[PDB]
PDB file of C-alpha atoms in Angstrom:
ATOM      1  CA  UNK A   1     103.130  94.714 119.416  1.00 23.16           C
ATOM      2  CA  UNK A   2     100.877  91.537 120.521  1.00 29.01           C
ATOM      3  CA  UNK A   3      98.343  90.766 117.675  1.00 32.89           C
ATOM      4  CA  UNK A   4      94.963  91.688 119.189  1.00 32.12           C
ATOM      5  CA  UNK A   5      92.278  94.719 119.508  1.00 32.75           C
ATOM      6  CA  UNK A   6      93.095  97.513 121.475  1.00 33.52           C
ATOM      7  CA  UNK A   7      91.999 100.597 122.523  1.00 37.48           C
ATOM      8  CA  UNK A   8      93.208 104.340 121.494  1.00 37.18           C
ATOM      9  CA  UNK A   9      93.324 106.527 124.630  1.00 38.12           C
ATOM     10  CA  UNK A  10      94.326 110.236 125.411  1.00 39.06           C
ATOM     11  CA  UNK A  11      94.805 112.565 128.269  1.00 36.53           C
ATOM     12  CA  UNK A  12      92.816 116.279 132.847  1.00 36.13           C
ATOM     13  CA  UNK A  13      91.534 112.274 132.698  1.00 37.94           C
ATOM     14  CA  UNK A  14      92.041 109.980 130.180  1.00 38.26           C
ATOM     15  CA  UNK A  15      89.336 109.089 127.474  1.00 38.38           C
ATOM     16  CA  UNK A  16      88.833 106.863 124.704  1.00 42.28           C
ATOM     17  CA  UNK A  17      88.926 107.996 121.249  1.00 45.70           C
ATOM     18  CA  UNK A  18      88.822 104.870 119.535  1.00 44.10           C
ATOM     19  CA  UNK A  19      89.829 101.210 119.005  1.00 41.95           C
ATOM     20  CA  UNK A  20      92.494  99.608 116.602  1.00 43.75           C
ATOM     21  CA  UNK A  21      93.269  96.374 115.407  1.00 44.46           C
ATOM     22  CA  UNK A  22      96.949  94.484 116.476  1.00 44.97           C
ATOM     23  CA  UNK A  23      98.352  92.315 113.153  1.00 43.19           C
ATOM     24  CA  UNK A  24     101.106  91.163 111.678  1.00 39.55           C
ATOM     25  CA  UNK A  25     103.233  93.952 113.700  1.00 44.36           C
ATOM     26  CA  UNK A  26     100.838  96.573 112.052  1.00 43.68           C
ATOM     27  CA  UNK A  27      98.687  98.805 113.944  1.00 43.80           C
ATOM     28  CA  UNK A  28      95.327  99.458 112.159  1.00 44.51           C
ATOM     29  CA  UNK A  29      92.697 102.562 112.655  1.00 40.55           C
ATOM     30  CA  UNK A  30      90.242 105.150 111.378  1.00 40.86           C
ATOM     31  CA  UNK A  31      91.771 108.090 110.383  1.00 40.57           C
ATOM     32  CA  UNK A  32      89.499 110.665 112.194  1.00 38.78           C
ATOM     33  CA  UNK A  33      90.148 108.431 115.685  1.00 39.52           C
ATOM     34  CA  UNK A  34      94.065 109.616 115.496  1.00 40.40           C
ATOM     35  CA  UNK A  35      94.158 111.844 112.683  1.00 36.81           C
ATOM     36  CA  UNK A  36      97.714 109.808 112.477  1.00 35.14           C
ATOM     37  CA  UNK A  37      99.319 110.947 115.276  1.00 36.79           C
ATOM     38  CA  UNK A  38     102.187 109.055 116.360  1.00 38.01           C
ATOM     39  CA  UNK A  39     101.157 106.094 119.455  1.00 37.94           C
ATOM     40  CA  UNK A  40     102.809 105.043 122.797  1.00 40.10           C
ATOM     41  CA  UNK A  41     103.009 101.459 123.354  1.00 35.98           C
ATOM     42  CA  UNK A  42     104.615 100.611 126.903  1.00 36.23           C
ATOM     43  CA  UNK A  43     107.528 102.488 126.059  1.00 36.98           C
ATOM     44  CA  UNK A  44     107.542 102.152 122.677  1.00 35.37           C
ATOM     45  CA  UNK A  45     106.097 104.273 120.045  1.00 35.16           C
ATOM     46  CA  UNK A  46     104.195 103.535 117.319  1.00 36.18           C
ATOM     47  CA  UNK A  47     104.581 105.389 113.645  1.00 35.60           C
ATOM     48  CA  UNK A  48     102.313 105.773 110.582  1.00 34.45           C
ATOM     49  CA  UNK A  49     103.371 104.394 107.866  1.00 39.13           C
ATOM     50  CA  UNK A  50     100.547 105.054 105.609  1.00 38.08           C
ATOM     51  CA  UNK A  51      97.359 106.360 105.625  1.00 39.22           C
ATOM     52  CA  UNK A  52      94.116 107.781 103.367  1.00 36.97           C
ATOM     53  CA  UNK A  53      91.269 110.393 104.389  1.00 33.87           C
ATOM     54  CA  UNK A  54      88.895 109.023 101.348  1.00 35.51           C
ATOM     55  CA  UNK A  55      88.903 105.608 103.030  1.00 34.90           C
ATOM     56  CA  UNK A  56      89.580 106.887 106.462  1.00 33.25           C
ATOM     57  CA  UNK A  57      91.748 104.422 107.203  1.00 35.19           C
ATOM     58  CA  UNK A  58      95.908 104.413 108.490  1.00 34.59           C
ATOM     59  CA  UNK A  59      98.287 101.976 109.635  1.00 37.15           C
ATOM     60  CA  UNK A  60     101.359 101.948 111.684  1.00 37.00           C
ATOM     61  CA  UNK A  61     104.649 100.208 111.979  1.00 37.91           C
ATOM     62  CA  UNK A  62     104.415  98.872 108.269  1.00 38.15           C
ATOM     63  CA  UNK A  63     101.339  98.629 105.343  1.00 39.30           C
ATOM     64  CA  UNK A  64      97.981  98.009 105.946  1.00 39.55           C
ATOM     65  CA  UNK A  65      97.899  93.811 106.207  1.00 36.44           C
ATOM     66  CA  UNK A  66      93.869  93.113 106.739  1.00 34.19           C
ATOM     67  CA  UNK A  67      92.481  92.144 103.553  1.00 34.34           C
ATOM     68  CA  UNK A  68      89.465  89.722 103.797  1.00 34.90           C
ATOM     69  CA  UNK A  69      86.436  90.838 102.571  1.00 35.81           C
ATOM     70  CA  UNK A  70      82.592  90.482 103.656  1.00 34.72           C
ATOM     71  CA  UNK A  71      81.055  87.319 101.247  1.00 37.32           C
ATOM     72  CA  UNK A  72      77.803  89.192 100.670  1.00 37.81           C
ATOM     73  CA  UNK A  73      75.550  86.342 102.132  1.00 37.87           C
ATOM     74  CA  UNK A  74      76.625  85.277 106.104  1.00 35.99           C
ATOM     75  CA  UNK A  75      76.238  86.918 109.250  1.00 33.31           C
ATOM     76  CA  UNK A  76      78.716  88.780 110.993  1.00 31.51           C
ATOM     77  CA  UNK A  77      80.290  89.935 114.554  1.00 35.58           C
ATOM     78  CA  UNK A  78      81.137  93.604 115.089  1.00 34.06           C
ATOM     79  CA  UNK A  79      84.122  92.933 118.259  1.00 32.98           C
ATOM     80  CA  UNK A  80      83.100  96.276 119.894  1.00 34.14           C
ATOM     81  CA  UNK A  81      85.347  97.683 122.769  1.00 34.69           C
ATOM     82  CA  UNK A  82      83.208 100.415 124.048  1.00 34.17           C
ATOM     83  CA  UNK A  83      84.302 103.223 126.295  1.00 35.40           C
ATOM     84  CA  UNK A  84      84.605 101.431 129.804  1.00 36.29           C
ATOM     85  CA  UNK A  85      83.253  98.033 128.604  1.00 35.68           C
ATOM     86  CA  UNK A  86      84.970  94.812 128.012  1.00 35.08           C
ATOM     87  CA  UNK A  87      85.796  93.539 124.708  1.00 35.12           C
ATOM     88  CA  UNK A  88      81.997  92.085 123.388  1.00 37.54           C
ATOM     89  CA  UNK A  89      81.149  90.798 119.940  1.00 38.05           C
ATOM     90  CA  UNK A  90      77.996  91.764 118.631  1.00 39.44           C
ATOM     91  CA  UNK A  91      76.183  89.349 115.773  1.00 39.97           C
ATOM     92  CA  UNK A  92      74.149  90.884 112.623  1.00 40.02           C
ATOM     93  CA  UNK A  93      73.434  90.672 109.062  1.00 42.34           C
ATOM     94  CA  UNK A  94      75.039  93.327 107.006  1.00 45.21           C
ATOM     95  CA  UNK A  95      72.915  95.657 104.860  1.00 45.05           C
ATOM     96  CA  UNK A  96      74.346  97.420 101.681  1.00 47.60           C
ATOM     97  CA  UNK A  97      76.001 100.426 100.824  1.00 50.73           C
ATOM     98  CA  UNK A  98      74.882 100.326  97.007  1.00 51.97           C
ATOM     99  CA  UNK A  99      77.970 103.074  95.327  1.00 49.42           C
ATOM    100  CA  UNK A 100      78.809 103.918  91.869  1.00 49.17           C
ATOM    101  CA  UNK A 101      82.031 102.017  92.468  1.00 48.05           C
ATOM    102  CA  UNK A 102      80.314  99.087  93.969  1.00 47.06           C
ATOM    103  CA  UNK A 103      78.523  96.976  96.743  1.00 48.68           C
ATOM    104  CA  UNK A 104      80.057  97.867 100.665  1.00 51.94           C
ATOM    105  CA  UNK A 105      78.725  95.907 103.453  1.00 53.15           C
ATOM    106  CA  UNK A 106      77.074  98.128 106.046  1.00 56.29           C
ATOM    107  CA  UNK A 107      76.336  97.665 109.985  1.00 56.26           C
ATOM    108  CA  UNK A 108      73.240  99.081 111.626  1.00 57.84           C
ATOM    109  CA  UNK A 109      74.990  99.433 114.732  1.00 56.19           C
ATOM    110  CA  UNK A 110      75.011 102.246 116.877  1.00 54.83           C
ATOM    111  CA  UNK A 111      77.886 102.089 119.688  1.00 50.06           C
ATOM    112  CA  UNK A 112      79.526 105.075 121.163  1.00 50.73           C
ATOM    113  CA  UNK A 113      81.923 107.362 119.252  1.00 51.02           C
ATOM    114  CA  UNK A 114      85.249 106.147 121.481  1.00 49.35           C
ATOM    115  CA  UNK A 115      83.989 102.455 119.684  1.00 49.37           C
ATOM    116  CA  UNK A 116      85.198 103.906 116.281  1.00 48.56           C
ATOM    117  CA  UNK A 117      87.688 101.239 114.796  1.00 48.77           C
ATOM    118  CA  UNK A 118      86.391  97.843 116.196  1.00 47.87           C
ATOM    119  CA  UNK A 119      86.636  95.383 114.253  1.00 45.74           C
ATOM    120  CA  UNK A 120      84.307  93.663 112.068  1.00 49.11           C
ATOM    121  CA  UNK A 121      85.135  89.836 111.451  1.00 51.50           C
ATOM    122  CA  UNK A 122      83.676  86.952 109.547  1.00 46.35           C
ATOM    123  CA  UNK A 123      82.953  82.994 110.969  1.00 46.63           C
ATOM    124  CA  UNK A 124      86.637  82.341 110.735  1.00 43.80           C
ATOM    125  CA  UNK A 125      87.916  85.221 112.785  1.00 43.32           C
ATOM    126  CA  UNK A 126      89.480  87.264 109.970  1.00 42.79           C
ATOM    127  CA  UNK A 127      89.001  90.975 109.790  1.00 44.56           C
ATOM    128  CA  UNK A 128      86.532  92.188 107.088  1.00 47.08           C
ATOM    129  CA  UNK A 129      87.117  96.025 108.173  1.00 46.92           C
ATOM    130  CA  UNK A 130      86.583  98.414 111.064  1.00 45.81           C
ATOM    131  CA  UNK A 131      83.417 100.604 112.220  1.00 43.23           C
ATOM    132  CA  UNK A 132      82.909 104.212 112.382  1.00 42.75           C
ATOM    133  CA  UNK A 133      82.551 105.706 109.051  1.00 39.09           C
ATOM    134  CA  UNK A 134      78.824 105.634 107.970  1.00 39.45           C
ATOM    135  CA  UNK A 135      75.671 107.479 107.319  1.00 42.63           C
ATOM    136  CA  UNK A 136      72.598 108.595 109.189  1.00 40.93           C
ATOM    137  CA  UNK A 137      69.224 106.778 108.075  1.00 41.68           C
ATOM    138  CA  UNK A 138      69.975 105.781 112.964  1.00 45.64           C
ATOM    139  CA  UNK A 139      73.609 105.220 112.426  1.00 50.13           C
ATOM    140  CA  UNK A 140      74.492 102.696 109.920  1.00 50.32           C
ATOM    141  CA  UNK A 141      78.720 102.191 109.418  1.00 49.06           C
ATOM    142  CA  UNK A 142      80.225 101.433 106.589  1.00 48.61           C
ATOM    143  CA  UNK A 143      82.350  97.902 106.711  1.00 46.64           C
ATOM    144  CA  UNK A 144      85.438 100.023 105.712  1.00 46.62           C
ATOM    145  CA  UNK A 145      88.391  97.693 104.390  1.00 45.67           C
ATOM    146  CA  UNK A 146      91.798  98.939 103.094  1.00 46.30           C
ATOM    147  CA  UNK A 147      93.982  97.343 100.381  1.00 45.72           C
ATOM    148  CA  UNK A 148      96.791  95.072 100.977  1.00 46.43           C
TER     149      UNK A 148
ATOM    150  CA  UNK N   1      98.045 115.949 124.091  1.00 47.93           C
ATOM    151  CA  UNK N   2      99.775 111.789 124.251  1.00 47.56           C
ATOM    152  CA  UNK N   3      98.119 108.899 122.459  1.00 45.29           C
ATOM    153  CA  UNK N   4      98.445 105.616 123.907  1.00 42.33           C
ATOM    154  CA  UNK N   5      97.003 102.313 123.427  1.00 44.35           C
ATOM    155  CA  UNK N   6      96.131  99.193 125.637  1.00 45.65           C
ATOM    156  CA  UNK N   7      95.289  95.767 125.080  1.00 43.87           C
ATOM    157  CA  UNK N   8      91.553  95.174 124.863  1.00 45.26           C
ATOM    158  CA  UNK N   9      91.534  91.244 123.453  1.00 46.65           C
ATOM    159  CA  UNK N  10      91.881  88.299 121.137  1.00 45.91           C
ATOM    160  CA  UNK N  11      90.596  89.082 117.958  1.00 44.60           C
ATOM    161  CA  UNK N  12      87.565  85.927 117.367  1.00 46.32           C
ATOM    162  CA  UNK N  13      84.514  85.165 116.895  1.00 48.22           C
ATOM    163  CA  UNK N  14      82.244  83.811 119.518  1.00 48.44           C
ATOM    164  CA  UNK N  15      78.975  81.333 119.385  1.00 46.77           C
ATOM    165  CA  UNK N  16      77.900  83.009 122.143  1.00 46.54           C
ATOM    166  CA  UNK N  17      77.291  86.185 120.720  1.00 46.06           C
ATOM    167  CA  UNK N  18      73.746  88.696 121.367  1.00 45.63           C
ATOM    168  CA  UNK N  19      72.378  89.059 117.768  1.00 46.96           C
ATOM    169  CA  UNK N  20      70.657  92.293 116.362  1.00 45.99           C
ATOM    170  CA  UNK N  21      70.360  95.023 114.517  1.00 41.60           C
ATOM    171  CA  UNK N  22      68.718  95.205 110.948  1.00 44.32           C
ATOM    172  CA  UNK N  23      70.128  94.919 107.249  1.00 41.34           C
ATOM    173  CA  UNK N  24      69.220  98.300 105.242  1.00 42.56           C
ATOM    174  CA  UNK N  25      70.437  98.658 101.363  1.00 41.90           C
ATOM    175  CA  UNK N  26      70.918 102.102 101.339  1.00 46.69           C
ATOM    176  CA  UNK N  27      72.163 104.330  98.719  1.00 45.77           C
ATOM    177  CA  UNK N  28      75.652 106.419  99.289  1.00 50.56           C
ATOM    178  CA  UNK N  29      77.717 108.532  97.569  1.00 48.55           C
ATOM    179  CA  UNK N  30      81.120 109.118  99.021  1.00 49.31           C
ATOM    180  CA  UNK N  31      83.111 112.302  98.572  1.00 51.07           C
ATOM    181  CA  UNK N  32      86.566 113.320  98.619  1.00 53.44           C
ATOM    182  CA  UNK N  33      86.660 113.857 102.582  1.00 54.22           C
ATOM    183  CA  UNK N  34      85.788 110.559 102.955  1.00 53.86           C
ATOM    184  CA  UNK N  35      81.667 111.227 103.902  1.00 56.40           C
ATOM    185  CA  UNK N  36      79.509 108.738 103.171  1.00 54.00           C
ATOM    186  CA  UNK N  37      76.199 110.468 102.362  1.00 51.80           C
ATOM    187  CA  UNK N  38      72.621 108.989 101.314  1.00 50.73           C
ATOM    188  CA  UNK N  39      71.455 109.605  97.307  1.00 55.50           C
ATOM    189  CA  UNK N  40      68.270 109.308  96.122  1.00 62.05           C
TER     190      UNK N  40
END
């Protein structure tokens, strides 16, 4: 329940499927990392609460609470937690995802699947979205944000 | 199949940080299953 970034395991072995982001008592992920099935936390578990294939998003515990958004211009730190790999933050200039609906920032990043839903933050440590939904140019992810 | 998750860190930034990776404006279309795909 401790604000932070964590990672999405499963078990033959354990593996990684993904990461998610701890805040405001609200668990956030990609969709396709849990495909919102319910989480154990200690001995707690987790529910979702709400959740959208489009954006590829869901939360748990309560609704989706990260709202900053990418400002177009400054650099940025994708806070990957790879499979097996500590907690690292990674520095870049977005690129664009030029839609019909609008501008998306975009990451050319390429980390391993299990890295899907690391966060994405700007200079004051607020999250702008998670990785892991994106195109092939090289993999470039989307900076996917819900709506709070 | 269980689900579980465990504490990875603190969510900030850090001056410290490796820098890379390039800044492509790309165009995408997205569709209902939520697939980004390039347009040209």
């Amino acid at each position: 329940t401790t604000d932070g970034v964590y990672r999405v395991m499963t078990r033959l072995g354990s593996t990684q499927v993904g990461v998610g982001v701890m805040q405001e008592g609200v668990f956030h992920t990609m969709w396709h990392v849990t495909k919102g099935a319910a989480l154990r936390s200690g001995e707690g578990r987790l529910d979702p609460y709400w959740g959208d294939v489009k954006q590829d998003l869901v939360s748990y515990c309560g609704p989706w609470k990260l709202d900053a958004a990418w400002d177009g211009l400054s650099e940025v730190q994708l806070l990957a937690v790879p499979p097996g790999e500590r907690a690292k933050n990674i520095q870049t200039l977005p690129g664009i995802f030029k839609t019909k609906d609008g501008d998306i920032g975009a990451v050319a990043l390429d980390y391993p699947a299990g890295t899907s839903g690391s966060p994405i933050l700007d200079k004051s440590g607020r999250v702008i979205g998670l990785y892991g939904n994106g195109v092939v140019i090289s993999y470039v992810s989307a900076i996917t944000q819900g709506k709070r | 199949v269980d689900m579980y998750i465990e504490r990875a860190g603190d969510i900030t930034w850090e001056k410290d940080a490796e820098v890379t990776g390039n800044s492509p404006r790309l165009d995408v279309a997205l569709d209902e299953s939520g697939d980004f795909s390039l347009v040209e």
